[PDB]
């Protein structure tokens, strides 16, 4: 007593928009550091009938009948996750049920410190995530500044983590958790140094490696698993999985952490797991452990380096003057434009990026930079030689933005009046489209 | 630089388990009150490339480029949602970003009362959800008992909500929110009466209609939208959508509630929306508003009434002695067996149900009932006449359970040694498979 005609038939209205979306993705230079493109197999898992099953709890201990094959999927995903990050199931545990990065983080922090517990994270404007305790004088923007007592460490004026500031703050504030691993941080992290500050104050070491996970799995960047108590990561960014998350926990350093984290995910926060996600994660984690995926990840850093190098060669300034990873933050102060303007300009030419703060940004109403990254385009086969074009396209967009602002003014509503039908923008779009639309698309 | 082989080729291990899961779903009598089967259209949305897009924020106010077609999908889903529940966009608003029911509830409660705020919900044992403030003597089991101050009202010894007890509790405790609408409650709710109790003590009325949503839309059961300040619902149960949730809020009764709820969902709790979910939710919400779907939902209640009636005709006791909705709770005290034993027995014959408390239960270690429901089997085409067969199968399972406990003992670990290779169970399983396997399966 259901309707089984295809999407296109049942809902032509929705099917048009999705078809539109697919054309825009195919025809965009996607430079969002946190985006990627999933393969057909990951998307086959996400559409699988396994999302019909309620399976609250954990393997073998399910509050519903008929969970025998769901248990195998969930245990396979845990296995592959410990394999991907080169950890022993004797020493490390992983919860695979968290619905996304933000949920995973609030859950993991709750497990460690409880309500009113103290945490330390990097400030938003310095590259930290919302879920690392972010707040404003005006309000407690994240739940992690409200359900917990949070304190925020800033980076220095060059953009680097200042460990002397982290230690000083940890000694006076005495948090139970210090969060490192970030959202728009272009350098690697001295986890050992964090571990040393946490041992000093008897605080847990939380590493959120969502943005850099693939590097950690492939041994290209530092490994927080040598030093960290908890490691969270989303699966949808550089790792190239579905939208989901993983909480890793060190049983050897913290006996009984396993039950606290598992009880935090369920029944404290979540109800039913999303088994289509877990399937999809299982599938991508198998790809992650092959040497082919390591080649992809290597290519991501090779593209990021080149893209950084080409922008500097066109007199564009970068936070920390470079990158150790997949992402760059461009400082736009020398052109007297905002990242909010460059994002609209770039949207008009099919270039996807985001506005981003820089260390000198006092207020998020006008961020002075944009963040870009290479995972997505590296998935489409762009090589090092291809990065000069992207750098040229971004250079041209900055210049057009400067022209548009001169003509129409620094007010954002006014600036947008300048964009539609602009002949250079139409010309740049056409160039962007022709190159992007040519690339392999999963 | 990706692998585009199909799922079967890239990951044969995982593909087999999923083919196994599909076979088990096809050949199971699924009586889980919270489960259903999605059509191929909803599953096409869930596997769509729209899940590649980061779109943190709300339509038009997005922190990333390239969100033009995502904004249309997200505004289409909100529109279709308000249409489905027969509310005007001038008086009612809806957030469509919550990842699941538990998230929706914690977010909505936070919006209304904040950390340390006071809430009242129905106790777990009496049919309430975990997210309605559930705790026990030993621990704050749900975050809704810890981040909030919760108190729990019980149903009477017959299983019905005791409004007198809710009034008494509200006057002494003075909560800021009262939650009604439940997980294992077999009757309809007098929301007006709740609205009257909330106006007395200036509390918000929260209706969680996850289990009865299709009835509320189709106008078969009482409508909490006439009375409630907030309505939450999952989209994966009787409504038959993907795994997601909706928060509805009453703008007329509560000017400014829109911002509170939207900011609670993001950036307080969540990060990026899962756009494949929102597409999927959009698709099914269109079906929900059709006359075909009302027919389905009427059939759910016609099946549930008949199933109640046939079980009573075989001397099986039901909590409240019947049902006004899609679900029944069988009291197993007269047979001296537990619901945990009947769940295993039923799992051995491909009958999916869950163990469930009844009002006399003092421990969730030994629940005295099972909950069953008709949405799933109703989706497979089962009519009123077919409920006698389901009732026959359940009666036989209870009888076999009694026999096995007699032979092997009351101990749960001992009882399971009875189940494998049991000739009658093999006979019953075979009978279950034959009827289930033949039905229409989306
Ligand atoms: C949207 C989002 N989520 N997590 C983030 C962001 C980022 C972000 C968040 C915000 C943000 C989001 C919600 C609330 C607030 C507070 C406020 O509006 O004052 C800021 C703002 C910006 C920008 F550039 F507009 F200033 C950026 C970006 C990755 C998009 C961010 C930065 N910078 C960091 N560090 O992390
Ligand atoms: C799994 C789950 N989520 N929300 C529920 C449940 C239900 C449930 C939760 C629980 C439950 C879940 C987690 C933690 C606890 C506390 C404890 O184990 O002591 C109980 C137990 C049962 C049962 F029957 F085993 F006793 C049932 C069922 C729908 C499965 C439930 C009941 N009864 C109610 N009212 O609501
Ligand atoms: C370090 C980090 N942790 C957690 C999250 C949360 O992920 P969800 O969106 O799945 O909640 C993000 C999101 N990253 C935002 C961005 O870089 O675009 C992140 O960058
Ligand atoms: C009334 C109610 N509200 C919210 C939720 C939470 O939904 P998620 O599982 O999607 O978090 C449930 C789950 N229902 C459990 C059951 O009846 O089987 C529920 O029954
Ligand atoms: Cl999903």
What distance lies between CA B36 and its chain's CA centroid? 10
Residue B47's alpha-carbon distances to A233, A280, B37, B52, in angstroms, are 22, 10, 16, 10
* Region for residue B80 given its phi and psi (left: phi exceeds 0; alpha: psi -120 to 50; beta: otherwise): alpha
Ligand 1: atom nearest CA of A127 is: 35
Structure-token pair, residue A353:
């990026």
Question: What kind of architecture, by CATH, is found in domain A36-298?
Answer: 3-Layer(aba) Sandwich (3.40)
In the sheet where B92-95 sits, what is the strand order?
A: B92-95, B245-250, B230-234, B204-208, B177-180, B118-122, B149-153
| B11-35+299-442: CATH number | 3.90.1150.10
Q: Which of B189, B196, B194 is nearest to B212 (CA)?
A: B189
Query: Which residue among A4, A22, A34 sits closest to B40, beta carbon to beta carbon?
Result: A4
Q: Strands, E, within B17-104: which ranges?
A: 29-30, 57-58, 61-62, 92-95
Residue of B39, B52, B63 lying closest to A38 (CB–CB): B52
Q: Which residues pair with A153 in a beta bridge?
A: A122
Residue A148 has phi, psi (to 5 degrees) of -125, 160
Specify the experimental method: X-ray
Is B237 catalytic? The answer is: yes
Map residue A166 onto helix, strand or coil.
helix
Instruction: Provide the 10 A C-beta neighbour count for residue A413.
Output: 8
Task: Answer yes or no: do A73 and B299 touch at CB < 8 A.
Answer: no
Contact A271 B102 (CB under 8 A): yes
- List the Cα angle B19/B23/B26 in 5-degree steps: 140
State the Cα–Cα distance between residues A244 and A238, nearest whole angstrom. Answer: 13
3-state secondary structure of A223: coil
Give the sheet arrangement for strand B327-331, strand by strand: B317-318, B327-331, B369-373, B354-356
* Partner-chain contact B147 A115, CB within 8 Å: yes
Distance between CA atoms of residues A112 and A92, nearest Å? 16
B54 dihedral zone (left: phi>0; alpha: psi -120 to 50; beta): beta
Cβ A393 vs Cβ A319: under 8 Å: no
Q: What SS3 class is residue B147?
A: coil
- Strand extents, DSSP E, B171-319: 177-180, 204-208, 230-234, 245-250, 317-318
DSSP state of B143: G
Burial B34-50 (b: 16+ CB within 10 A, else e): bbbbbbbbbbbbbbbbb
Q: Which pair of structure tokens corresponds to residue A409?
A: 């003014």
Q: Scanning the structure block, which residue is given the tokens 């889903």? A: B77
Element (H, E) at A149: strand A149-153
H helices present in B314-362, as ranges: 339-348
* Cis bond upstream, residue B267 (ω within 30): yes
Helices first, then strands: H and E counts in chain B: 16, 15
Chain A neighbors of B115, CB-CB under 8 A: 115, 146-147
Task: Find the DSSP H helices in A289-356.
Answer: 291-313, 339-348
Measured between alpha carbons, how far is B343 from B352 in angstroms, rounded to an integer? 7
**DSSP state for residue B351 in the 8-state scheme:** E
What tokens appear for A326 in the block?
């997949």
Asked whether the CA dihedral B170, B175, B180, B185 is positive or negative, the reply is negative
Out of A2, A46, A70, name the one closest to residue B379 (CB): A2
B200 burial level (CB within 10 Å; 0-12, 13-18, 19+):
exposed
Q: What phi-psi label fits residue A71: left (phi over 0), alpha (psi between -120 and 50 degrees) or beta?
A: alpha
Spatial separation of the C-alpha atoms in residues B22 and B436, rounded to whole Å: 13
Report angle CA A382, A308, A371 to the nearest 5 degrees: 90
C-alpha A188/C-alpha B53 separation (Å) is 26
The minimum CA-CA distance between A32 and chain B, rounded to whole Å, is 8
Distances in whole angstroms, Cα of residue B431 to Cα of each of A23, B29, B32, B151, B269? 50, 11, 19, 46, 48
Q: How far apart are the first and last CA of chain B?
A: 35
Say whether A35 and B46 touch across the interface (CB within 8 A).
no
Whether residue B109 contacts residue B166, with contact meaning beta carbons closer than 8 Å, is answered with no
Chain B segment 255-284 residues within 8 A of A by beta carbon are 267-272, 274, 276, 279, 282-283
Resolution stated for this PDB structure, in Å: 2.2
CA distance B121 to B106: 13
- Please pick, among A243, A253, A260, A309, the residue that the annotation labels catalytic: A243
Nearest to A181, CA basis, from A230, A235, A146: A230
Tokens found for residue A371: 């963040």
Angle separating helix axes A275-288 and A68-84, nearest 10 degrees: 30
Ordered by start, the domain boundaries in chain B are 11-35+299-442, 36-298
């Amino acid at each position: 007593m259901f309707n089984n005609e295809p999407l296109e038939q049942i809902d032509k209205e929705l099917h048009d928009i999705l078809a539109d979306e697919e054309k825009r993705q195919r025809e965009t230079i996607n430079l969002i550091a946190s985006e990627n493109l999933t393969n057909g197999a990951v998307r086959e898992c996400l559409g699988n009938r396994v999302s019909n099953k309620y399976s609250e709890g954990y393997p073998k201990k399910r509050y519903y009948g008929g969970n025998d094959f769901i248990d195998k999927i969930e245990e396979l995903c845990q296995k592959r996750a410990l394999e991907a990050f080169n950890v022993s199931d004797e020493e490390w545990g992983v919860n695979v049920q968290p619905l996304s990065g933000s949920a995973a983080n609030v859950q993991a922090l709750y497990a460690l410190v409880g309500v009113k517990g103290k945490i330390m994270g990097m400030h938003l404007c310095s590259g930290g995530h919302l879920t690392h305790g972010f707040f404003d004088e005006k309000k407690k923007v994240s739940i992690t500044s409200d359900m917990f007592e949070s304190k925020l460490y800033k980076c220095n004026s060059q953009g680097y983590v200042d460990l002397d500031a982290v230690r000083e703050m940890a000694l006076s504030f005495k948090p139970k958790v210090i969060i490192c691993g970030y959202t728009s941080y272009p350098r690697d992290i001295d986890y050992q140094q964090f571990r040393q500050i946490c041992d000093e104050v008897n605080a847990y070491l939380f590493a959120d490696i969502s943005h850099i996970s693939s590097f950690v799995a492939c041994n290209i960047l530092n490994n927080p698993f040598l030093h960290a108590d908890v490691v969270t990561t989303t699966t949808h960014k550089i790792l190239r999985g579905p939208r989901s998350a993983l909480i890793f926990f060190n049983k050897k350093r913290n006996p009984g952490i396993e039950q606290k984290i598992n009880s935090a995910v369920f029944p404290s926060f979540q109800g039913g797991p999303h088994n289509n996600k877990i399937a999809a994660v299982a599938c991508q984690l198998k790809e992650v452990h092959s040497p082919a995926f390591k080649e992809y990840t290597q290519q991501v850093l090779l593209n990021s380096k080149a893209l950084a190098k080409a922008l500097i060669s066109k007199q564009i300034d970068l936070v920390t003057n470079g990158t150790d990873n997949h992402l760059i933050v461009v400082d736009l102060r020398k052109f007297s434009i905002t990242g909010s303007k460059l994002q609209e300009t770039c949207n008009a030419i099919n270039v996807s990026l985001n506005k981003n703060t820089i260390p000198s940004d006092v207020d998020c109403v006008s961020p002075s930079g944009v963040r870009i990254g290479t995972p997505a385009m590296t998935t489409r086969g762009a090589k090092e030689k291809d990065m000069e074009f992207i750098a040229d396209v971004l250079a041209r967009a900055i210049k057009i933005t400067v022209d548009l602002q001169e003509q129409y003014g620094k007010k954002l509503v006014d600036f947008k009046k300048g964009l539609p039908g602009n002949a250079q923008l139409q010309q740049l779009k056409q160039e962007v489209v022709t190159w992007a639309g040519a690339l392999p698309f999963p």
